[PDB]
Amino acid sequence: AGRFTKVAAAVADSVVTIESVSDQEGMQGSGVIVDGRGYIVTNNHVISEAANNPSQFKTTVVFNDGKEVPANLVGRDPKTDLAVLKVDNVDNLTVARLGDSSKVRVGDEVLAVGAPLGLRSTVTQGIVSALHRPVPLSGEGSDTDTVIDAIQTDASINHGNSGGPLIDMDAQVIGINTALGFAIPVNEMKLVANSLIKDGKIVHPTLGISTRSVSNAIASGAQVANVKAGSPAQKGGILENDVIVKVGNRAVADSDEFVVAVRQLAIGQDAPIEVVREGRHVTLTVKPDPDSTLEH
Secondary structure, eight states, rough: OOOOHHHHHGGGGGEEEEEEEEEEEEEEEEEEETTTTTTTOOHHHHHHHHHHHHTTOEEEEEEESSOOOOOOEEEEETTTEEEEOOSSSSSOOOOEEOOOTTTTTTTTTEEEEOTTTTTTEEEEEEEEEEEEEEEEEOOSOOOOEEEEEEESSSSSOOOOTTEEEEEEOTSSSEEEOOOEEEEEEEEHHHHHHHHHHHHHHHHOOOEEEEEEEEEEEEEEEEEEEOOOOOHHHHHHHOTOOOEEEEEETEEOOSHHHHHHHHHOTTTTTTTEEEETTTEEEEEEEOOOESGGGGGG
């Protein structure tokens, strides 16, 4: 058999269909089996409309054999476009082999695996085009738009493999497909899934700043469009018109890298912010708040 046929066939039992149906609605996506207890990882937008209307929506998981089993929302993260589901007492579960997104290199051949039984299911072929690429993602329901540090791939990422794993040539998951194709790295997924399984929620850093992208000589980075009153930004000396060029130990090229850089900051730990103010370079100190206070 073929090199790609072998890998895709080896991971098909760990990939599942996720259907969220209602009286006048019927979303569908793909997921992956990450734990033998019934733990399934998908993206937030696949199940966003359902989590927001649990009264009218019902979610199920369709496996490779065809068994449709009820599923329960463990926890979701609109910030990383990630979500966990749980199927109860389902046996003989084929669990995906989780790989290391840190060892992933540009040019690495990959497969974007969709669920074999899904309506418009797709299995795509390509290579890793870019590592650590800040990418904006649209929020499905009432969910907020975010940006993620993704693995970029020339393999087609579409409705048919969205939520499904991004697999290497070793039949290991290195990422979850999103909605010119991108995937949430597995190393970030393992961190978000761990908090979403345990606490049903992930806490992310917040600073209270809105940024617009700027690229003009010295002023190349994220320009402060708005400051929130009482924000760690206001306490830190941050102003409008200001161009953020470094957040922590990470340079900020634009609004996209800013959102990602803020989320790599430690919660409650003082952090360096470097801005270009009215032509002058200025370092400001900010302590990051929890986005969810009663959950920190």
